Write an enzyme that holds these catalytic residues in place. Sequence first.
Site, PDB file in Angstrom:
ATOM      1  N   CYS A  83     -22.549 -20.211 -39.701  1.00 28.50           N
ATOM      2  CA  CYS A  83     -23.931 -19.894 -39.209  1.00 28.50           C
ATOM      3  C   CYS A  83     -23.882 -19.648 -37.823  1.00 28.50           C
ATOM      4  CB  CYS A  83     -24.879 -21.209 -39.606  1.00 28.50           C
ATOM      5  SG  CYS A  83     -26.382 -20.821 -38.762  1.00 28.50           S
ATOM      6  N   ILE A 159      -7.290 -27.602 -44.141  1.00 29.93           N
ATOM      7  CA  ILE A 159      -5.678 -27.600 -44.329  1.00 29.93           C
ATOM      8  C   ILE A 159      -4.871 -27.133 -43.278  1.00 29.93           C
ATOM      9  CG2 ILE A 159      -5.897 -27.131 -46.737  1.00 29.93           C
ATOM     10  CD1 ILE A 159      -5.089 -24.138 -46.307  1.00 29.93           C
ATOM     11  N   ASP A 160      -5.565 -26.903 -41.926  1.00 28.03           N
ATOM     12  CA  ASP A 160      -4.709 -26.286 -40.858  1.00 28.03           C
ATOM     13  C   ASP A 160      -3.934 -27.331 -40.352  1.00 28.03           C
ATOM     14  OD1 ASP A 160      -5.585 -23.486 -41.268  1.00 28.03           O
ATOM     15  OD2 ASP A 160      -7.580 -24.103 -40.383  1.00 28.03           O
ATOM     16  N   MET A 202      -0.437 -20.543 -44.429  1.00 35.07           N
ATOM     17  CA  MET A 202      -1.614 -20.461 -43.480  1.00 35.07           C
ATOM     18  C   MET A 202      -1.232 -21.039 -42.228  1.00 35.07           C
ATOM     19  SD  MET A 202      -5.187 -20.837 -45.350  1.00 35.07           S
ATOM     20  CE  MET A 202      -6.054 -20.661 -43.731  1.00 35.07           C
ATOM     21  N   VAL A 293      -4.675 -19.165 -52.093  1.00 35.54           N
ATOM     22  CA  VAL A 293      -4.339 -20.015 -52.931  1.00 35.54           C
ATOM     23  C   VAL A 293      -4.089 -21.543 -52.225  1.00 35.54           C
ATOM     24  CG1 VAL A 293      -3.381 -18.269 -54.124  1.00 35.54           C
ATOM     25  CG2 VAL A 293      -1.715 -19.852 -53.171  1.00 35.54           C
ATOM     26  N   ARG A 295      -6.007 -23.044 -50.039  1.00 37.18           N
ATOM     27  CA  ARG A 295      -7.388 -23.626 -49.443  1.00 37.18           C
ATOM     28  C   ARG A 295      -8.066 -24.056 -50.788  1.00 37.18           C
ATOM     29  NH1 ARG A 295      -8.995 -21.116 -44.733  1.00 37.18           N
ATOM     30  NH2 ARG A 295     -10.620 -19.491 -45.752  1.00 37.18           N
ATOM     31  N   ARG A 466      19.325 -50.685 -62.657  1.00 39.69           N
ATOM     32  CA  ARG A 466      18.826 -51.774 -62.062  1.00 39.69           C
ATOM     33  C   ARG A 466      19.556 -52.988 -62.222  1.00 39.69           C
ATOM     34  NH1 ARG A 466      14.227 -52.214 -65.040  1.00 39.69           N
ATOM     35  NH2 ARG A 466      13.159 -50.634 -63.858  1.00 39.69           N
ATOM     36  N   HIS A 656       6.576 -43.401 -69.404  1.00 37.53           N
ATOM     37  CA  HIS A 656       7.521 -43.400 -68.057  1.00 37.53           C
ATOM     38  C   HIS A 656       7.042 -41.611 -67.490  1.00 37.53           C
ATOM     39  CE1 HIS A 656       8.865 -46.798 -69.402  1.00 37.53           C
ATOM     40  NE2 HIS A 656       9.965 -46.532 -69.262  1.00 37.53           N
TER      41      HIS A 656
HETATM   42  N1  LIG Z   1     -19.932 -23.519 -29.465  1.00 36.41           N
HETATM   43  C1  LIG Z   1     -20.484 -23.999 -30.551  1.00 36.41           C
HETATM   44  N2  LIG Z   1     -21.722 -24.404 -30.390  1.00 36.41           N
HETATM   45  C2  LIG Z   1     -22.556 -24.500 -31.242  1.00 36.41           C
HETATM   46  N3  LIG Z   1     -22.158 -24.349 -32.858  1.00 36.41           N
HETATM   47  C3  LIG Z   1     -20.955 -23.993 -32.848  1.00 36.41           C
HETATM   48  C4  LIG Z   1     -19.994 -23.869 -32.025  1.00 36.41           C
HETATM   49  N4  LIG Z   1     -18.925 -23.221 -32.371  1.00 36.41           N
HETATM   50  C5  LIG Z   1     -19.056 -23.090 -33.788  1.00 36.41           C
HETATM   51  N5  LIG Z   1     -20.253 -23.683 -34.006  1.00 36.41           N
HETATM   52  C6  LIG Z   1     -20.926 -23.630 -35.516  1.00 36.41           C
HETATM   53  O1  LIG Z   1     -20.035 -24.325 -36.539  1.00 36.41           O
HETATM   54  C7  LIG Z   1     -19.878 -22.958 -37.397  1.00 36.41           C
HETATM   55  C8  LIG Z   1     -18.234 -22.756 -37.709  1.00 36.41           C
HETATM   56  O2  LIG Z   1     -17.520 -22.114 -36.828  1.00 36.41           O
HETATM   57  P1  LIG Z   1     -15.951 -22.471 -36.922  1.00 36.41           P
HETATM   58  O3  LIG Z   1     -15.297 -22.232 -35.527  1.00 36.41           O
HETATM   59  O4  LIG Z   1     -15.437 -21.229 -37.918  1.00 36.41           O
HETATM   60  O5  LIG Z   1     -15.472 -23.816 -37.457  1.00 36.41           O
HETATM   61  P2  LIG Z   1     -14.198 -24.399 -37.582  1.00 36.41           P
HETATM   62  O6  LIG Z   1     -13.570 -24.690 -36.857  1.00 36.41           O
HETATM   63  O7  LIG Z   1     -14.278 -25.295 -38.825  1.00 36.41           O
HETATM   64  O8  LIG Z   1     -13.406 -22.878 -38.765  1.00 36.41           O
HETATM   65  C9  LIG Z   1     -20.580 -21.881 -36.636  1.00 36.41           C
HETATM   66  O9  LIG Z   1     -20.973 -21.126 -37.713  1.00 36.41           O
HETATM   67  C10 LIG Z   1     -21.702 -22.900 -36.084  1.00 36.41           C
HETATM   68  O10 LIG Z   1     -22.759 -22.910 -36.782  1.00 36.41           O
END
Ligand SMILES: Nc1ncnc2c1ncn2[C@@H]1O[C@H](COP(=O)(O)OP(=O)(O)O)[C@@H](O)[C@H]1O
Lengths: 743, 743, 180
Positions: A83, A159-160, A202, A293, A295, A466, A656
């Site tokens: 978002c 997973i990173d 990844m 595959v 994630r 054993r 087993h």
């Molecule tokens: N500096 C920031 N300030 C506010 N919200 C942030 C910021 N960075 C990331 N986000 C929020 O978290 C979401 C995920 O960003 P992302 O970097 O992709 O996350 P992640 O590190 O898990 O991959 C964004 O869409 C936003 O809603």
Amino acid sequence: FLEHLSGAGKAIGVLTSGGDAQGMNAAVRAVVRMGIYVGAKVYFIYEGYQGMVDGGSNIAEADWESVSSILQVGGTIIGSARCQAFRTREGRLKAACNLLQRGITNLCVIGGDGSLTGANLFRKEWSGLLEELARNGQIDKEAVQKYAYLNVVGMVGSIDNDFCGTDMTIGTDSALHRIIEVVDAIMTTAQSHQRTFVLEVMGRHCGYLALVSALACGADWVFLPESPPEEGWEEQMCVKLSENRARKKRLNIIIVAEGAIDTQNKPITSEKIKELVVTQLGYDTRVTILGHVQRGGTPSAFDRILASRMGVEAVIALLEATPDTPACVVSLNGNHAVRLPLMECVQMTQDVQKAMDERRFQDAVRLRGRSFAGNLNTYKRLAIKLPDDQIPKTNCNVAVINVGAPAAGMNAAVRSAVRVGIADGHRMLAIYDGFDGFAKGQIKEIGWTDVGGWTGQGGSILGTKRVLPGKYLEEIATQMRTHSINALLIIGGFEAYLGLLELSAAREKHEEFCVPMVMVPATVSNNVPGSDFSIGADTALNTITDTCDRIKQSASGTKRRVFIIETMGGYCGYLANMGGLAAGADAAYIFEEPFDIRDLQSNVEHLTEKMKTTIQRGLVLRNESCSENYTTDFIYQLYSEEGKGVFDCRKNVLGHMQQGGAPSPFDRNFGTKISARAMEWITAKLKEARFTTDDSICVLGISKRNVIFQPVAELKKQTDFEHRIPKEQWWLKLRPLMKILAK
Amino acid sequence: FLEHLSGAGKAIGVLTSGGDAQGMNAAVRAVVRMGIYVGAKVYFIYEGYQGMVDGGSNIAEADWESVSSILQVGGTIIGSARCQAFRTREGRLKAACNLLQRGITNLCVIGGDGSLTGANLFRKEWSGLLEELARNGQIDKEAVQKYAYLNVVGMVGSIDNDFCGTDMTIGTDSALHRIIEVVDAIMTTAQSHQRTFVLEVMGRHCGYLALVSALACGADWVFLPESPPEEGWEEQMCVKLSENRARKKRLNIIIVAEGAIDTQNKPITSEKIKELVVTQLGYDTRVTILGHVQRGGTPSAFDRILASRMGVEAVIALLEATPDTPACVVSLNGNHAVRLPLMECVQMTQDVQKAMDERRFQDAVRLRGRSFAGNLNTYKRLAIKLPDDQIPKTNCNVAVINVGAPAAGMNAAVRSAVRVGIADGHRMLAIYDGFDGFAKGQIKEIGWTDVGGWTGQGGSILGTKRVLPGKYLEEIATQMRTHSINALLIIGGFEAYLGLLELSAAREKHEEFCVPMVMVPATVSNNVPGSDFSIGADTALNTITDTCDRIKQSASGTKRRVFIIETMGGYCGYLANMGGLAAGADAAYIFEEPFDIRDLQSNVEHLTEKMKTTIQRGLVLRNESCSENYTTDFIYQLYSEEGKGVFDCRKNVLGHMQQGGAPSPFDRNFGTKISARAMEWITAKLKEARFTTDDSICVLGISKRNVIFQPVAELKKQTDFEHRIPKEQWWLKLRPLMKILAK
Amino acid sequence: TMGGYCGYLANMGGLAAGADAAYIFEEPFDIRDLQSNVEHLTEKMKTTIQRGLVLRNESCSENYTTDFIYQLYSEEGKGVFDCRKNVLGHMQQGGAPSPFDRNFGTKISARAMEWITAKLKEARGRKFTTDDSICVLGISKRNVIFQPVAELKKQTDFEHRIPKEQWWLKLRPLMKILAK
Ligand SMILES: Nc1ncnc2c1ncn2[C@@H]1O[C@H](COP(=O)(O)OP(=O)(O)O)[C@@H](O)[C@H]1O
Ligand SMILES: Nc1ncnc2c1ncn2[C@@H]1O[C@H](COP(=O)(O)OP(=O)(O)O)[C@@H](O)[C@H]1O
């Protein structure tokens, strides 16, 4: 003991934003069911952050029945989404406003490096977001004071694992499986056409999954963003592959990090390699980029446990946090879950990126984890054999052996133990058929090219019985007194313990046992005292948790039915408990926790009230021998006559099949990792004479955060020889927790 | 019976050249062990053809112990390689010469389209190759007449399946697993970020694995080289994806063949699609090329069986072939293995490429297989819902139900049954909780978007109880009317059979049961008479064959040990036999084959002579109830006291873990495939009124090569109601074979 | 004790030997009736009588078997009393017949032979198709009576092979109050 303290009346919102990793569901499951247990309202927040901005259909309360039947699934049912309309105050307000409309004062975010930092700001801007909402008069003027404080908590989920605040982040073990699964399959296609493969795992920033996976499949070469190749690696790699064809290894596997780089930020693409080997060696080469595959897929046991534990430790951290207390990010350190400051953690994570960008690789390594350095070192010093004549021989005889029941990932421990020995300057002797063979003379010196390609194989090769040596204490010494054996390395379970414990006896009777011996936990039971973990344990535990899911399938298909599964593992209810918590069993009867016909009766009642809701299934695990009277049959016999009319039930005695299949990546590493440090304790204490005192014969094993060598002597105290289980057992702390996730 | 005339003296050569597919090892295992049983010598030929040219170290005799412990591995231990120095007579001679030096007169090649054609020429040039060897004086002048005739036999081996001489080629089912495994994993990562994926399966020529896999994971769109997309597909695809978002399917999976093309030879890259959807729909999209993970991995049950049966039928064909008899290529047709002419087979294979290159796609389809056309038709007519108003409603009520024990891949049968019904013009009614619910009124009309995404889920959703329709016939009649039902489909095991039969003679009685009814085999037992296979059978068999390998692990780690596993499945020893042959059990005691304390005694002896060789393991499977006196305990009790001193032994009773896990790709298809043709038989027989006879209630199942609808009436004959198994059972023909292979 | 589902043998024998409880099929019972009986057996292990005898009908319950019953009583006593289990074999229906049977056999068998001789003289100067042409002679009230196998379909449980109404169940409360 702390079940009393439970903030009620309040509510919490849960969401997921970031690399949707496995086990994420198992998390939101522990959060919802715990949030209710404490007596508060838990709301769902679909599409991660985006759901907050929107609102309405993206916010709903969650019942105990809701987060049911999701634990055993990857990805996230809550839904994830990036978002942008939140990274701006102009819209971050719409989010806040929508929260007060539902009465949510606390929040739990499960994302990554960025997603967390998002709430870290929201947390602060809150007092400022309520000032605008009250001003413009969009929210009741009263609310401006009831919901003045805003508590949030972050959770490791991706997973990173490019996070140093916690050793393991929900997803790693799962993605690690996905990687190894692909490799183990590819290895059969390459062992035929005798070719070489280049894989791209990844990790655009952190080259974690790139190193652990490699060590897990005994890879030939690895490329990591933190520890790039020393200038002149191009010819150094061909040197390896050139020798692998001369040694007859008709298979070569290359692991490359998604963000590989060399001495200089210059990227190291997987093709740049495919070109290098084929245009300089002529070997047939094929490179493949492991799709997303990594994630997806089913969450492993480790991931579910860690998830379910974090989800709880997070809920408590939320209502146990003060208006002025720093943002916390629950994480598993060492072995016990501990909350940490969010900001301080994001700092460490960013710092690794900082160092890397400034050719400070050396520092960027000891910044990702104090185990990372040890892993890289272990790997490399085990995947490269410096010329036979450049290795300063010590002219000492060290012997390895497998005593006890076969455990998956045991061969992995031998591979390491042998190579870390030859590369240290010792001649290696292999004792086949456990002790039974030791006394028979089934001893043979093995080499480096011998233990090659074992890290992937399960079961045992050097055999393993054993068979107690307590009566053949002669035929043994007699053998060592005709092999120059000056060292020993046992790999098994409790049987092995008694092995060393007995050996130490015939020292003032047999001058042959008077040598250094180190035992390493290698059993699916995990009853080995002096270690919180055992080799091959996480494997069976994974096989069990899996099988329980397939059994919860036929229990759901046929409405109203309960299953009673009898897991093995002597008196040690480890397997029984961890598996019960990982598959979400309504109850797991272990030996370590007594129970009468009442604890049983009072549980059949809870099972009846569930046959009213949506979940018309029932799963109960029982330790092989937790009670001499209440057997698998008894438990079933009771549940049947006591349900008759409400539900049906059957029983299964896991064979087993548990301790059998290919070893889990966690064992493929554990076996190789803590066995080398077991071989150095030998080289280090063998150089001291380059042995009497009851200690030269100990048992290396995981204790606190790290492993430590404890002399088998002082372990006689914390050990129940009658039931073959350690006195004090850590995983019992999860007992109250495990159950509150039942009802 | 036929094992009478065998053959000795001569020797056979085995090799592998081509796409190293799984189950290839399980093939060379049956060839070696069989070639010895017949009394001949079997030699190994490493590196496929290249080994022939070379010689020496690439040619060795194989003992019974050799091909042991390889069956459960992918790729090929013999080694494969492309040899060019053979496609030339100038070097094809060195191959021939080296063969006479070992006395090999017969040969078995396990490769592909090209590899086989190689020996087809070698077979002919033989007389001419011995003419030059004798002339130049390189081989004993005598040999020129003792080894004058050269017999060869080819064997289907490659996951491509671009062979029309056989329906399935050793590898398909295995590579199909690898594909589905990857997908089922990716679907959890896509169901979160609500994105669309484009996968690229193998098959540069044949677009088989591309169709079958798709049908197995309920894909959205497929691209095949034989049936390209109608001009104007670009917008038609977007039409689908556009509706999937409108129907709330937050997941879209695209399957593309490695050699995809459109109306014209113009290639259809997976990127050309990634561009199309994102640049015309805006949906997030990621395309991944499934690496060689399709040729690697562990061989499936189907593959091992087919492999083990082909290796034998090949051996007999070698010594049962005349000097002038055409080159044979053993292959499984319909259900029974039959040998076919090599050249005539390669022709068909080459003809499919001919048609495709000449825009004759229409003919190229009915040239790859008479089932292909039926599969493509099934898929498509089940993945596209022509507008609600363009579907000529029939205003008829058809209802589906799941009677019996839950079987993996049952939901798949419902998905198909439902859609093929709505798309035919019927309104669908779903009966929940099998019969128990039918009488309760647990009936509810379901739609198209409802049964969406079931082909992948295991267990059951519409519930399923083994309760018979007898005692509550009235509670079912009254209800029957309430919904005005006309057609009833059933997805159950022997349970359903008794259902249809009880409803048959119960017509004159309750005039509500006078309508079309079709049952479909759906049990892990496979006791359903009137069908050689059952839905969910190949799944449990796959879980069993797996678990056995994991047990064969702990039996090898601890030298000299025997296990006794009790598989389930009523009296029907199907599961017990196929699993025993797939895991290489020393013996499988089924009910259908009587045995006394002597057949048992004479087998413990064989088990003892094995505890002398390298293989110090022992595996014996016993049918749930093959004998009332010799139970799992008895068998173990004997084996113990009769070995005491030579080997140890334990016992395991496989639980319902078998019929539980996610359905196998073969079931994911079987369920969907033969379920639609069951729904049309209804649409076809309900439109006949535009119903009280023995031809209104039948069991649609596999018989000869194809399925056929047999009235439940005439099935009373070939059926044992006391033991619940069909009288005549086909898979009993493999009994002698299964045993000679294990010894 | 054996005897199909009919708990006759099990009950009459338990009252004749003074068993602390006899679990028959005809009288349902849950883990509670079992639990509340182990308690009474514990309070006895305080008095002079330090013995315990419990009889179980061959198949009074599919779940609560001889082993189950014993498996519970063992763990539920552990510390107060010991306990073992015995499965009476066919030794019961074997030895020489009891004087009561030596008579019963001879007695009611003769009156069964006359019912034949008498129903051979009936339609002599006068075929059998009625329902009272094939009856069963057996003790009912005070005396025996011939009941046509026809009207006996009612008071009979064919599933468990035991007559629906069984008189000796009136002795159930009695039998137990005599066991404390
Ligand atoms: N500096 C920031 N300030 C506010 N919200 C942030 C910021 N960075 C990331 N986000 C929020 O978290 C979401 C995920 O960003 P992302 O970097 O992709 O996350 P992640 O590190 O898990 O991959 C964004 O869409 C936003 O809603
Ligand atoms: N006419 C021929 N003469 C000799 N060898 C041939 C001939 N055609 C094919 N081959 C052999 O088979 C190889 C071709 O690969 P192929 O077997 O066609 O693969 P696939 O098993 O995938 O179908 C060649 O390298 C050669 O070793």
